[PDB]
Amino acid sequence: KTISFNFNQFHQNEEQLKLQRDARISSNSVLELTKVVNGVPTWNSTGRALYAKPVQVWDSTTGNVASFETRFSFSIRQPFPRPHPADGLVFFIAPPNTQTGEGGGYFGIYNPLSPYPFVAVEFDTFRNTWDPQIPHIGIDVNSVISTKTVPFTLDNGGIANVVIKYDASTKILHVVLVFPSLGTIYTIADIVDLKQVLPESVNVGFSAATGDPSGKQRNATETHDILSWSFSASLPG
Template sequence: KVKSADTVCFTYPNFGNAVSDLILQGAATPDKGTVKLTATDSNGIPRTNSVGRVLFSSPIHLWEKSTGKEASFSTSFSFITKPSPKGGTIADGLTFFIAPPGTTIPSKIEGEYLGVLEPSTGNDPSKNQIVFCEFDLYKNGIDPSYTPHLGINVNQIKSEVTAPWNTTNVPTGSTAFVRITYDAPSKKLSVTLSYPDVSNSFRSTLSHTVSLKDKLPEWVSVGISGCSGLQVSLNNLLSWSFSSELKKVGTSFAITDM
């Protein structure tokens, strides 16, 4: 029996209307019903060293200090990433991140830190308070041998776990669909990326066990970032939905498709 709960639920099937409940940071701008995450010039050519982020404006109650109970959540979003019209290597990637309220774009932009960590402290977990799922397009020194890849990161840019981002049979510019869930009882954070509109494409999956209440404050912000460094790409967020529930009495939360 559930007597009370802190719940948050929002859905943006597109970004064509007013998005007053969202915060756009950095290069993030509305663009024909999408949010363009990284900057372009007047000719549509991606700019180097660009970060854009979209955050939900209200804080999320992630866990309750008096009981230690955690919220379960699920989030889904879709995006397109493609190379510059001028060609070249595609980089750097996107993240879904959970961070303290008031989080801002790093003061120095380097592509490998994906718009969520300062380069000076991004390799030191004692200096950060953030959990994020990365969708990494470009191989940097700390990355696995396979690129592109998915990663789950806790307080640093080196991923706790990674998995290949399978783009076999996927044409350039196809829409990627992401689903991320956190099951509080099992403390399992799971990521799935797929291309349901592409025949014969493959699903990429990844999971990691982590207690979010041990890594993050009681109240948090959630957001999506896109970043380009010296290598660039076009990155557009097409949709985003999120649902969380912190049950103050009771133990179960069913994660279902949104």
């Protein structure tokens, strides 16, 4: 059993995507996860985009877990350097039918009063109390307190290429971050047993958030645009 989809770009009312909260598709084909009005990113924004259909990451009858690969390009533009941009974006896998969680440092995937499990790769731009230096790539399992972290320098407004791969046989989740204009390459990997944390069926997608009002800083914002996205998963059985 193999499942896959590709998006060279995004159109309005894409039937394959489920948009939540502030997430919207612009006229020029980009998926804007967080609010941007008249070319300016705003604070107090949270948005998600999930692939409409659920994907099976493992089968309880055979015990087999799926291997998958996903590639996407994103762009984060930070117009206001002072005092600090926030908050970042993530690629995540969660149970089907979840609702947007808390914003700010929780990226819209963590809900304190009704926590659901999730695996996510974050591109964190704001340093919360639980964070190391930013920006950083992080692998998150059921929490925003990453199991592994690696710092990276953002190409402000530039295009970034990401490759996330999961090998079921080794349980290795490895991610690659490339900024073609700068020629920089960042890599991080960790062991994650999907079968142990997630249910057989899940939703895959993105989520992002800008500065929380409690920070009292309107400049704590940035864009979180997804330019393209392909996904492929193989479950033997």
